[PDB]
Amino acid sequence: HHHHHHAMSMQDTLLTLDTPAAVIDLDRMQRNIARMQQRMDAQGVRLRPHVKTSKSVPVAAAQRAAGASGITVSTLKEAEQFFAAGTTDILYAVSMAPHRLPQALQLRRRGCDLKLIVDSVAAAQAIAAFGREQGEAFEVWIEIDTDGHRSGVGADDTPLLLAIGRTLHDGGMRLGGVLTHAGSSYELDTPEALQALAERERAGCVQAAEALRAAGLPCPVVSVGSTPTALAASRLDGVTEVRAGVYVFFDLVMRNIGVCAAEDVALSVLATVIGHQADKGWAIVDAGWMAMSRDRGTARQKQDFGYGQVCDLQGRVMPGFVLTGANQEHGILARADGAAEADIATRFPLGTRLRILPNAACATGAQFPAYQALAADGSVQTWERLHGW
Amino acid sequence: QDTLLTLDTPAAVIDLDRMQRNIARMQQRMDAQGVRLRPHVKTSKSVPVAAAQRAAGASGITVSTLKEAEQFFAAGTTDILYAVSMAPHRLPQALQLRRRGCDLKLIVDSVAAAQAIAAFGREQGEAFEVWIEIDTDGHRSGVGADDTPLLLAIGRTLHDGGMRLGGVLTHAGSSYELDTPEALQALAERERAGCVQAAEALRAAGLPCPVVSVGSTPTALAASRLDGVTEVRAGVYVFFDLVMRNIGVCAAEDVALSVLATVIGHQADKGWAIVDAGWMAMSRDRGTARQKQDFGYGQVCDLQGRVMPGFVLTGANQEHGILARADGAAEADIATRFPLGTRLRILPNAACATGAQFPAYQALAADGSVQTWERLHGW
Numbered sequence: 133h134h135h136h137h138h139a140m141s142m143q144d145t146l147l148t149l150d151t152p153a154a155v156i157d158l159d160r161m162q163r164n165i166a167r168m169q170q171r172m173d174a175q176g177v178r179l180r181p182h183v184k185t186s187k188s189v190p191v192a193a194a195q196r197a198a199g200a201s202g203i204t205v206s207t208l209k210e211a212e213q214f215f216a217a218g219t220t221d222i223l224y225a226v227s228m229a230p231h232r233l234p235q236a237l238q239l240r241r242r243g244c245d246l247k248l249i250v251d252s253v254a255a256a257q258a259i260a261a262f263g264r265e266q267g268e269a270f271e272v273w274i275e276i277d278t279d280g281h282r283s284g285v286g287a288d289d290t291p292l293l294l295a296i297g298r299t300l301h302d303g304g305m306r307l308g309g310v311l312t313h314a315g316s317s318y319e320l321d322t323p324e325a326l327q328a329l330a331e332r333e334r335a336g337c338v339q340a341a342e343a344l345r346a347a348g349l350p351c352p353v354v355s356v357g358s359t360p361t362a363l364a365a366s367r368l369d370g371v372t373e374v375r376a377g378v379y380v381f382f383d384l385v386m387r388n389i390g391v392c393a394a395e396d397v398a399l400s401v402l403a404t405v406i407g408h409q410a411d412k413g414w415a416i417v418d419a420g421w422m423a424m425s426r427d428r429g430t431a432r433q434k435q436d437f438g439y440g441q442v443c444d445l446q447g448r449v450m451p452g453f454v455l456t457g458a459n460q461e462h463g464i465l466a467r468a469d470g471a472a473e474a475d476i477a478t479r480f481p482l483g484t485r486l487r488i489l490p491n492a493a494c495a496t497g498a499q500f501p502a503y504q505a506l507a508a509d510g511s512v513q514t515w516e517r518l519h520g521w
Numbered sequence: 522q523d524t525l526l527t528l529d530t531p532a533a534v535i536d537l538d539r540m541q542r543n544i545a546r547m548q549q550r551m552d553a554q555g556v557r558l559r560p561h562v563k564t565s566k567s568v569p570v571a572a573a574q575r576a577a578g579a580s581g582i583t584v585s586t587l588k589e590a591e592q593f594f595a596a597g598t599t600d601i602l603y604a605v606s607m608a609p610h611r612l613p614q615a616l617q618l619r620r621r622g623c624d625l626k627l628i629v630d631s632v633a634a635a636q637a638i639a640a641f642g643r644e645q646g647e648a649f650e651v652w653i654e655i656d657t658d659g660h661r662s663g664v665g666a667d668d669t670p671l672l673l674a675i676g677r678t679l680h681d682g683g684m685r686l687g688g689v690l691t692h693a694g695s696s697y698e699l700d701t702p703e704a705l706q707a708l709a710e711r712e713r714a715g716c717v718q719a720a721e722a723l724r725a726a727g728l729p730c731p732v733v734s735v736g737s738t739p740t741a742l743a744a745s746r747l748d749g750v751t752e753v754r755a756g757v758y759v760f761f762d763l764v765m766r767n768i769g770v771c772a773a774e775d776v777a778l779s780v781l782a783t784v785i786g787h788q789a790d791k792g793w794a795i796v797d798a799g800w801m802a803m804s805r806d807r808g809t810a811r812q813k814q815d816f817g818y819g820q821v822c823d824l825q826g827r828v829m830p831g832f833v834l835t836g837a838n839q840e841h842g843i844l845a846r847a848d849g850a851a852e853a854d855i856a857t858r859f860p861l862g863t864r865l866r867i868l869p870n871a872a873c874a875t876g877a878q879f880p881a882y883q884a885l886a887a888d889g890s891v892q893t894w895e896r897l898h899g900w
């Protein structure tokens with residue numbers, strides 16, 4: 133059995149991978165994918181996962197297989213990659229730059245049903261003029277600011293919403309919907325505050341759609357979501373789809389917001405112990421910030437996990453030990469409480485492998501060309517992901 | 522031709538005239554000290570950047586991973602120091618590089634790692650070259666500078682084990698917390714002294730120690746004398762960054778890496794311009810937050826590279842940066858100053874962190890044309 137025997141001899145596990153490596157526990161990932169799709173199905177709304185967390189074709193394929201409708205992307209590079217992989221229904225959810233209009237036009241002309249978003253009269257004018265010149269009715273949604281976080285028209289700003297919506301509609305473009313992202317949910321840590329923010333996000337985005345429609349303008353989609361508000365919303369009246377992406381893996385920021393446990397976290401960075409400073413209680417590992425990223429989202433939350441929570445090779449949290457510091461290719465493993473562990477070298481011998489849970493999975497993942505997707509039998513497979521623009 | 526007007530954004534642009542001045546400045550300082558410069562390529566991981574460093578007089582390179590050793594060896598560079606405590610599990614990869622003809626040097630700071638190297642080398646018929654890392658300032662790895670028994674035990678393990686004990690090295694990375702010439706000079710002296718002290722203790726015990734290697738970019742530029750030292754290692758100086766400007770070893774105008782970004786909208790009530798360089802372009806590094814002037818997620822410059830003091834990225838989401846006044850006020854009519862589609866260039870907090878976010882740099886020539894210079898990602 134030639135292929136079998138060769139593949140067996142080539143197969144990696146967590147003991148044979150070189151470190152650092154970004155490992156996806158596939159069973160935890162599938163539980164996360166099921167949980168989010170079940171919740172949206174219960175709310176009677178579509179799920180349009182945001183692939184910026186993974187930028188990985190097989191990850192998005194698992195989201196689609198579970199029932200997802202389309203994807204959200206954060207770059208046109210993502211739109212190109214996932215359209216080539218067979219995803220047609222793609223929302224580019226970053227305010228459209230006019231100079232990217234030729235690439236968006238080429239993606240639509242090759243058969244990608246690519247939606248763009250704007251929040252200004254001038255961006256709507258640019259799209260409509262290019263669309264008229266090029267004989268393309270782009271679909272464009274208007275981004276709404278519901279929580280003061282980032283881009284978007286105020287939900288209560290009827291004159292600007294009308295001006296933008298008329299610019300698109302009069303200009304022969306398809307005004308397809310409104311969207312909002314309540315990213316301020318990341319500053320909360322109670323179920324009450326998260327439920328209230330999810331209600332403000334839904335209410336505001338539906339308010340903007342109702343004002344466009346009261347002026348005779350079409351607005352068939354109402355799209356909301358962050359992972360914390362997707363999991364917290366009690367009701368989604370008026371909403372057609374919810375966008376969420378970090379949930380596929382979760383991370384320690386999400387654990388601190390309270391929408392998951394550390395044991396739901398599916399992404400970890402496999403690392404090796406490469407030295408010590410025994411008098412300071414330090415183990416030095418080969419996962420520095422270039423593996424973890426410089427994200428320190430947990431520093432301002434209820435529990436600071438430094439550059440990440442230490443787990444053993446079986447993925448079980450080792451409470452009390454975190455990466456307290458990080459240089460580029462070296463992480464400093466020590467007690468979070470600030471005590472010097474006695475005998476750090478017997479606790480973590482040279483060559484020991486550990487798995488570090490990330491502050492932010494979106495930021496850790498981008499540091500790696502690929503993930504190693506870990507199956508229940510202990511084998512891994514390389515799953516590429518996209519870097520750059 | 523491709524230029525700053527035609528590139529998609531965000532893009533990581535190296536101003537070649539600025540890079541070359543940085544290259545010349547460091548090389549000239551190391552010449553004046555009578556030491557070799559072994560640049561640390563972990564800042565750029567880019568073959569043409571290191572080629573310009575070599576053209577100006579650099580001797581060999583330092584790398585932070587064996588993937589960089591593979592890349593630079595495949596491009597013809599053979600004098601490579603891998604300056605991260607060696608993991609025994611990567612010994613097969615190091616061995617294959619040496620057998621292929623790469624003169625790859627490894628480092629250790631423990632008896633156990635030295636025993637692992639020496640046993641594998643004897644079995645494989647390879648006299649690995651290994652330097653001992655010395656801790657001269659409490660920053661990271663290494664044998665304590667006055668820890669002679671540890672030093673000698675590692676040295677004897679290597680040399681009596683049939684390996685080539687090639688040298689000692691230190692990196693005084695605590696230089697990054699300083700911001701005065703006096704304090705940088707004293708740290709550079711402490712770095713030099715402790716590294717030299719270790720070499721002398723090896724030699725006094727009859728062990729070879731031909732290389733004494735020190736450096737960080739701040740201590741390379743601040744050191745008043747380098748007696749006893751054979752080479753200096755420095756990397757971030759090739760581009761500089763705002764961390765370095767705040768340490769005081771360069772000006773913002775010297776920073777040769779910037780991120781070209783387009784204005785994609787505004788929040789006029791807040792005086793924000795939104796740009797398409799978020800933290801995925803800048804990285805999450807916020808090293809200037811702990812220094813005397815905080816530059817947020819980066820210092821704004823105009824398309825010509827003019828620094829615009831007082832505008833910085835005060836915040837950043839993944840693919841959106843928030844450009845606003847550093848003084849906290851709301852710029853009145855921000856959209857009339859920076860209309861949609863305006864291009865700006867952002868100086869990074871940490872050149873090593875921002876560079877790693879991009880698959881390639883755009884190297885900007887005097888005539889305004891660019892050439893793409895790929896760089897390495899991953900392990």
Ligand SMILES: *Cc1c(COP(=O)(O)O)cnc(C)c1O
Nearest residue numbers: 182225313358359375376377378
């Ligand atoms: C990232 C993002 C999402 C998903 O939010 P998470 O909390 O990261 O899952 C949704 N919509 C927009 C516009 C996004 O940028």
Ligand SMILES: *Cc1c(COP(=O)(O)O)cnc(C)c1O
Nearest residue numbers: 561604692737738754755756757
């Ligand atoms: C990065 C590094 C250097 C170069 O110091 P910079 O201040 O970044 O130029 C030298 N030696 C070692 C061991 C390093 O890790």
Ligand SMILES: [Mg+2]
Nearest residue numbers: 378492494839
């Ligand atoms: Mg995120």
Ligand SMILES: [Mg+2]
Nearest residue numbers: 209521528529
């Ligand atoms: Mg491109």
Ligand SMILES: [Mg+2]
Nearest residue numbers: 460757871873
């Ligand atoms: Mg650095």
